[PDB]
Amino acid sequence: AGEILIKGGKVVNEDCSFFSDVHIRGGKIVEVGPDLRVPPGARVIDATDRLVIPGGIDTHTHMELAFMGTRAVDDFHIGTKAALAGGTTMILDFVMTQKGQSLLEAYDLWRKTADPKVCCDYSLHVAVTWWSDEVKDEMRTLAQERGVNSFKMFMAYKGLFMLRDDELYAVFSHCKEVGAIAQVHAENGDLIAEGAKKMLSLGITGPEGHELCRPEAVEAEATQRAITIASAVNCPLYVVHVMSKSAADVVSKARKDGRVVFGEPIAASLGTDGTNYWHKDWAHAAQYVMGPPLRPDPSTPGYLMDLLANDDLTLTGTDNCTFSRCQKALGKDDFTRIPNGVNGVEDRMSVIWEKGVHSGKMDENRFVAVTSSNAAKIFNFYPQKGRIAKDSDADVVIWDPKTTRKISAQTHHQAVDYNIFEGMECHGVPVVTVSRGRVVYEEGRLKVSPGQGRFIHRQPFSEFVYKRIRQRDEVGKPAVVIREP
Amino acid sequence: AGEILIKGGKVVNEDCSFFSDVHIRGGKIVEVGPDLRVPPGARVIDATDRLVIPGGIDTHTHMELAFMGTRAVDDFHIGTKAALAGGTTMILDFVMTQKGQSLLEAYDLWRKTADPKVCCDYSLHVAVTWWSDEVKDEMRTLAQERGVNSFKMFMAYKGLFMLRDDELYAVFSHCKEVGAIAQVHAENGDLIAEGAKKMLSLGITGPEGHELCRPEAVEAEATQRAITIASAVNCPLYVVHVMSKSAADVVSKARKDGRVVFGEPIAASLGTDGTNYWHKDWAHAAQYVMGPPLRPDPSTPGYLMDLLANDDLTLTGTDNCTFSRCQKALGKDDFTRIPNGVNGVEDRMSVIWEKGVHSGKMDENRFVAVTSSNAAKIFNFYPQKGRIAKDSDADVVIWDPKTTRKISAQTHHQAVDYNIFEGMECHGVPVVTVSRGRVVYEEGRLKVSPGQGRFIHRQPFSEFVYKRIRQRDEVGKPAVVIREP
Amino acid sequence: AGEILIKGGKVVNEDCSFFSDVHIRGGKIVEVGPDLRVPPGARVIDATDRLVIPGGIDTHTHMELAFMGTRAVDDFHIGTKAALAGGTTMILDFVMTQKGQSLLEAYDLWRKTADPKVCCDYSLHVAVTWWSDEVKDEMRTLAQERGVNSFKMFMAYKGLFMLRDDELYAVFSHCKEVGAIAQVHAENGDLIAEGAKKMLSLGITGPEGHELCRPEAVEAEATQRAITIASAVNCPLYVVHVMSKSAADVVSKARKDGRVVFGEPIAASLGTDGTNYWHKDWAHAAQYVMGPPLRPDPSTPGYLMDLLANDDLTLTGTDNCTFSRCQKALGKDDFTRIPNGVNGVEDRMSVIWEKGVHSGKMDENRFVAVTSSNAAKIFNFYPQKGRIAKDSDADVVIWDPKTTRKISAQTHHQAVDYNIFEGMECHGVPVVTVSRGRVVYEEGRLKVSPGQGRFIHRQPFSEFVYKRIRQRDEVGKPAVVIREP
Amino acid sequence: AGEILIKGGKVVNEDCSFFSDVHIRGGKIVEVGPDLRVPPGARVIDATDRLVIPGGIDTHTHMELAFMGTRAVDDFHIGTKAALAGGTTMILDFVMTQKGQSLLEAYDLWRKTADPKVCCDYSLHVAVTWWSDEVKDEMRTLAQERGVNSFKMFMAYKGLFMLRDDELYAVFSHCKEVGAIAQVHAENGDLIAEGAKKMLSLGITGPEGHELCRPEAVEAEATQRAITIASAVNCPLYVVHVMSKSAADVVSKARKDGRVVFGEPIAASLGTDGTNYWHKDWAHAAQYVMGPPLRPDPSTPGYLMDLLANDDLTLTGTDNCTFSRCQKALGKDDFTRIPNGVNGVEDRMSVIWEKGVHSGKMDENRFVAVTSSNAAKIFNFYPQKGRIAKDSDADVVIWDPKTTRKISAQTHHQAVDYNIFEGMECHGVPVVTVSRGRVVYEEGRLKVSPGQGRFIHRQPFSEFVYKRIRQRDEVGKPAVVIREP
Ligand SMILES: NC(=O)NCCC(=O)O
Ligand SMILES: NC(=O)NCCC(=O)O
Ligand SMILES: NC(=O)NCCC(=O)O
Ligand SMILES: NC(=O)NCCC(=O)O
Ligand SMILES: [Zn+2]
Ligand SMILES: [Zn+2]
Ligand SMILES: [Zn+2]
Ligand SMILES: [Zn+2]
Ligand SMILES: [Zn+2]
Ligand SMILES: [Zn+2]
Ligand SMILES: [Zn+2]
Ligand SMILES: [Zn+2]
């Protein structure tokens, strides 16, 4: 069996917190309540003075992605181990289909790579990086049979992944038809391409050139544009890696205006800023390079945390896409060649707790919402995950909100040899991680086998995403004026 | 016993909706799950094609209030009956303590009046309409022993209930000390007093004078002021009856800015507008008169519903404070003498469903949040109410979202002889109402006895309200700069 | 000679108003001051109780444009006559170069058509409707030798005039190089194309389909996008025909943010709204059809006037592009075939005075700014026009602000057989119009000859437009961080 | 006579810039034009490579004010000398009438003190620090006979100058009746009083306590409140010393909304920030203390300059109210006793040029608007001052925009022994200052006699301020609905 009783702790769900024990049997939570009996043989995890929360769900990872010449060093095995050590029990990774390549082939290739390696549960989003009848069919198959209800489109990466407004319109229309959510990388790829060309011609080859060629206006513009096209076809939209105040404000305004759109800041944009691109040490600066870039306005991470607290922004991922110091160095003379991507999978939970809960910006319940529950709602497996309740999956973290840990590449479990949060002292430590009903992390040690985690198959038409869309299809149809001919 | 099994319906909570039966025994929900056994003797309510939702909680009523010369016609008995017929199973009414009068006496007087009459559960807020050592002591007693964690302060009603900024500061400080929430009637009472004097001198004695003397700037101003004072003392704030776009925007901005404040639109401001004050029929116009007034900008109710959907605004009441046609007529020659107050207790649920869910602005789950769950969270009895779950109170409504009912003073159960929503066709009908585990409304008929309802005693420091306040007390203390003398 | 002395009136300039006579000799104002001597032979125009203002400058006309199959009925001759009768003494018309056609040929063709016909002064903007080395050269020639410092680009009209973001970037870059201002028609042409296709498939063929296929989000999106690209290249930008609140707000925000951008509402969007597209009479509805469309939110024209008063919006034109009732009827069965364009050249001045000055939104001086002075500043001939002062051109209107005139296609001087402002009672009447130092309109009668007006040759680098751009070129250059290799 | 010909320079007015000489005779500009003849005897000031601009007008000074126990060290003599040396040729100083004291007596006392000492022209605003029939009469006399059209009211300084909302309403009403503009010190005096009491009890006695007791919310709140009351009585309003982003945004929103209100940032809030209150050196920190305080958000001065460039904010003063290092030291142990006030009169022009024009935020013409022209328009002597034109007063500065000067208490002409802009390198130097047609400053040396300057008597109903107010009185009267009784 493996029975666990988590005793003495305070359960924290998105709605409220309460003292109760949690009885885990066979991969599931089978009872939640005060003073539960320890069945003979069951292991007791003593959660006295700890919070018992749903494991974190990272909506946004790229484990071992082949990108910009080289492949990310955190792979599905190490990446999921590092996740677990940081209190994160599921990741959602992007199938980065190449232009002209079958989405089903790319999906198959990702499942073959990840299935034997993941140490925690996971699922996949599929990038739609070109358009045709075939992609159209494949999206339906993915949504109805392969357990994927999220497709990722790019407005940046000109020549590589970018789609133009007419194609986004079509793609978004078909997302709505198959009951998928549309995710977008929202930056203006034409401005980025011109921008970088210009920074290089001016001899600005360092990482400050990377930020200067695509300042936050370029992100805010494409964010509004994506929302507008999606609003025109009544397709639900998800803006991945919101990095800037102005893009966050676009999302905030559109939601207030009743648009079905969700904004996802990431640990990087919540925990540090882009002043690091101006560091005198080139290696240090390059560590932070990713698209969109972190912003040189120091008030950014605090502001994004305030909007995350208030639900202008709704949930978090990390965009974990790591490259070692010697891989980043590929762009020593030209920032367009630094492989883009930062760490976060392991530290997300502590970073958000320290910058969001300890700071007084959000409460512990909103913390659960924005680290697991909302991901489960949008991507369609709530309350199977994201809630401590009978019948839910036993993905559970015992959390110490009072003790601190200092984040350091010297003690972290990620494969990357630096950490963008190097030195940060965070309140909020994952003391014990349970995944699929097994203790996989405790006393600073991991106990898990590659392949122990499972792919989570999801159904389309997630209710949290589609119930308003469908009611608007029914009452928001345009009408003709009846006239004499 | 009275056992009820509600079978075949779809349960709708704030987080998600799911098919399940609900077993009610002894005033409580004792089981929720699929295909439950009907125990011998238990009555089955067939909820096939219906939603099974928590009963509505009206945060804002004034049943039989003696006000402006006369007393409201809907009393605790008829008012709670009408509530039940409209799908609302709890009301929170205001103890309107007079200036210089003991808050404990006023509280006692309200409990004596309401206890033998209420047909559904209820609780009370207490108005703090003057300030002194005695009021200070009485507030502590109310909060610690009398089950009241909400105190109501007025920035309008000059000469009558109004408090100045220094007194609000003190009052708000002491609310924070006793773990109460501060509610405010946010209009500038000095502008209202000057405004009305001016409208009368210009011979504008009709109800249009009532709105013109205190247009929405006057509400927005006092709303910002209340938020600022409350932010200065770190006291949680609740703005009652938000009537206008601009005041709603103040609340929306303050929350985005991380201020602990909640905004409560009411059915009136969600379901109609203030163009009615300009109606050629004086009686018709006077029906809508209340403070703050409904606004002549027709886009108002739709905008307030959009902000309620997005959580800029968080929950709803009705400010039910009804006066018959012949009572309103007291101000035939002078709008300052029309007793202020409109209906809503009965129609709130259908009005919000039609204007909010049927319109596609919010989903059924957000509907439960803004009609019961959030009230229970703020006023500190969740999930005892506001949730369909084992151990919760059996206050449950079987709801038909597809059928319409037309609202009319001819068919309504309120004592008042008109209805501000006269003629409105609403999708969303309460077909069966269960209160304290008894069927009190079914087949258009009420079956309930005055006194059947119970006063709900609450504890202070509601966690949903105070967890951020307390963390800010711990990390947001101002520090001195250490200097050589 | 033709000497005129305008006596007894109050001169109104953009900065202030003052009593003075104005002495006109040889096409120029040669003296302004109190109690001027009447030289023997000079005609006195008695301006007692009248304002003496600079003639209106219409920044935005399409006289006799061949468009959507047919050509506008108001031609350079009738159009300029109608302008004069309405108090407007200069128009700036768009050379609508076709895709692949020489801009110089189109320019020559417009000068040949207009020179022998105009009855008042005029100048030209040139549309850049495709991109290449040749267009690049021609733009330089136009700017340096042909008196044109304004080029017009389209984000709408897919297949016809539309340019993509990379081309706008290049085009805007070259505008900056030649010291021109970039004008943009800011709507998303991909959304319009999809939108219309969809409205037709739903059998919405009436004019309401025209507005519904491109609601204001589509305008606001492209407006932000244009501003962003122009900000990226430091090119000054001008947004023509701002029709909606949301697009106006984009412009307002960008200016507050220090972006060099100007917004131009037109008489149509200041004086009426798009509810007319829903009129039961098809002919009536089609009268209002133009791109972007007038908006069905009735608060629009008032809001645009408030932003024009506050300088969020800076100056006005009419987009005068008129088609008779039988020409509009070309789209009786399909709104995509209604020739787009409304009237305004004649009524602009009275419409803006009535809706802006008489309403109390702006003063008479701001009225001069937004009807002549700012056009002269941006398009680079101030104070030669747009000011009553010694040495300025004698384009002068004697204006009665107190008397009303009702606008009617029955009394107007435009060739079109209807008027979108039909029935409007406007305070503010042009009683006498002086153009090039000659009385061309008085006692309701026109006295002017086709060809009397002159083309105004302008120089590039208008100081009002470029002084900030050039200082930013000097201090806003991006810098490299100096690092060890 | 004293004739001066200023030759070879570029004249810069609010509307445009142009090459011309300026002929000065007898205190007036008597001709402006190219290549003017030098009359025998006239002194030529060679303005080759210089701008010739209207002298600066400082709307906001307190020369030798007795305040908080002691009197400001810059008096009318030294203060006006320092003004002249900085390119400022007029100051408007506040008659600080004490509570219960005759406004006419205070006015007389200020004229007696200033008349024999001023070295440049000046005028006065009168503070209305209490309310009664007598103050009412005195305000009329001041406005009609004493040349004052601006009255200053306080929402801060509880116990000392503060007025409550009902009194502001009355005061603002009477300002409108006498054709005066209402100026307000907009901070919530009740919050300040509580705030400071709290900071002291926590042992925060340093200048950081001064800012922390009244953060920018306290300013923004009172700013909105003042605007609302003034909007209710249709009285034009002027918000003095706007110090914070949020208060500036209130003003910006109200103007966009068509409210007649003007915002005046000062040199301090445009040129430095409130991080200085946290300096380890107490003397340094105390130098910056004034009400409202400078703000610790470093983006503030840049943001205020952007809103000044865009006309959200309209004109500038300095609030010059200086106290020596040993006078500031009066509050060594208690920040409530540091005499409030900073320097600026001398450096305003260079500070604004460097931070506003050199930075690319505004052009030279907007610079003239916000340093002289708008003050002259609002306070009612334009174009007698604020314009280089025939008949205007010869208050003229020859300005070098290319050379820098470093500001230092070691080289400045103010009496105060420190400078809040210490060390700042500003482009933009006043090389020659002409006041009343005499060279009073050249080659770094002053040549002027105490009493040479004149008091400027103004008339009420300034047109720039009142033309919209009066039109709204005529068309914005509320109407009754006509009903059967
Ligand atoms: N961009 C980046 O740096 N991380 C992942 C690649 C992407 O999605 O943009
Ligand atoms: N105002 C009103 O009309 N209803 C209740 C009384 C109040 O709270 O203002
Ligand atoms: N569009 C329109 O209706 N008038 C002129 C053509 C254009 O510029 O769009
Ligand atoms: N406050 C200040 O520091 N300067 C002048 C006094 C005032 O007006 O507030
Ligand atoms: Zn991305
Ligand atoms: Zn990514
Ligand atoms: Zn109230
Ligand atoms: Zn109430
Ligand atoms: Zn156009
Ligand atoms: Zn046009
Ligand atoms: Zn002040
Ligand atoms: Zn002052």
mmCIF file of N, CA and C in Angstrom, chain B residues 227 231 234 253-262 468 472:
data_model
loop_
_atom_site.group_PDB
_atom_site.id
_atom_site.type_symbol
_atom_site.label_atom_id
_atom_site.label_comp_id
_atom_site.label_asym_id
_atom_site.label_seq_id
_atom_site.Cartn_x
_atom_site.Cartn_y
_atom_site.Cartn_z
ATOM 1 N N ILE B 227 -10.691 54.853 2.296
ATOM 2 C CA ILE B 227 -9.594 53.930 2.023
ATOM 3 C C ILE B 227 -8.257 54.473 2.548
ATOM 4 N N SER B 231 -6.097 52.798 5.310
ATOM 5 C CA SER B 231 -4.753 52.329 4.951
ATOM 6 C C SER B 231 -3.727 52.897 5.960
ATOM 7 N N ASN B 234 -3.785 50.703 8.931
ATOM 8 C CA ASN B 234 -3.818 49.279 8.628
ATOM 9 C C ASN B 234 -5.074 48.583 9.114
ATOM 10 N N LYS B 253 -8.916 50.404 -7.909
ATOM 11 C CA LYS B 253 -7.525 50.896 -7.897
ATOM 12 C C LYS B 253 -6.861 50.567 -6.541
ATOM 13 N N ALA B 254 -7.583 50.817 -5.449
ATOM 14 C CA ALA B 254 -7.002 50.592 -4.114
ATOM 15 C C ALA B 254 -6.666 49.123 -3.929
ATOM 16 N N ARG B 255 -7.509 48.208 -4.416
ATOM 17 C CA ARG B 255 -7.214 46.789 -4.251
ATOM 18 C C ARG B 255 -6.004 46.375 -5.084
ATOM 19 N N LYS B 256 -5.963 46.831 -6.340
ATOM 20 C CA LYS B 256 -4.809 46.562 -7.193
ATOM 21 C C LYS B 256 -3.537 47.047 -6.519
ATOM 22 N N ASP B 257 -3.710 48.114 -5.735
ATOM 23 C CA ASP B 257 -2.610 48.707 -5.029
ATOM 24 C C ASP B 257 -2.395 47.945 -3.678
ATOM 25 N N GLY B 258 -3.131 46.883 -3.431
ATOM 26 C CA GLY B 258 -2.808 46.017 -2.309
ATOM 27 C C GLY B 258 -3.495 46.531 -1.043
ATOM 28 N N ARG B 259 -4.400 47.502 -1.145
ATOM 29 C CA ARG B 259 -5.139 47.925 0.064
ATOM 30 C C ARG B 259 -6.174 46.879 0.443
ATOM 31 N N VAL B 260 -6.310 46.644 1.764
ATOM 32 C CA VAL B 260 -7.318 45.647 2.226
ATOM 33 C C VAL B 260 -8.699 46.347 2.256
ATOM 34 N N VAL B 261 -9.401 46.282 1.126
ATOM 35 C CA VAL B 261 -10.696 46.920 1.061
ATOM 36 C C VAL B 261 -11.601 46.048 0.186
ATOM 37 N N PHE B 262 -12.871 46.027 0.552
ATOM 38 C CA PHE B 262 -13.861 45.250 -0.196
ATOM 39 C C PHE B 262 -14.997 46.208 -0.619
ATOM 40 N N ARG B 468 -3.527 39.118 5.992
ATOM 41 C CA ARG B 468 -2.605 40.094 5.435
ATOM 42 C C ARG B 468 -2.368 41.302 6.419
ATOM 43 N N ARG B 472 1.386 42.348 7.791
ATOM 44 C CA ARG B 472 1.879 43.709 7.583
ATOM 45 C C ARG B 472 2.245 44.402 8.929
#
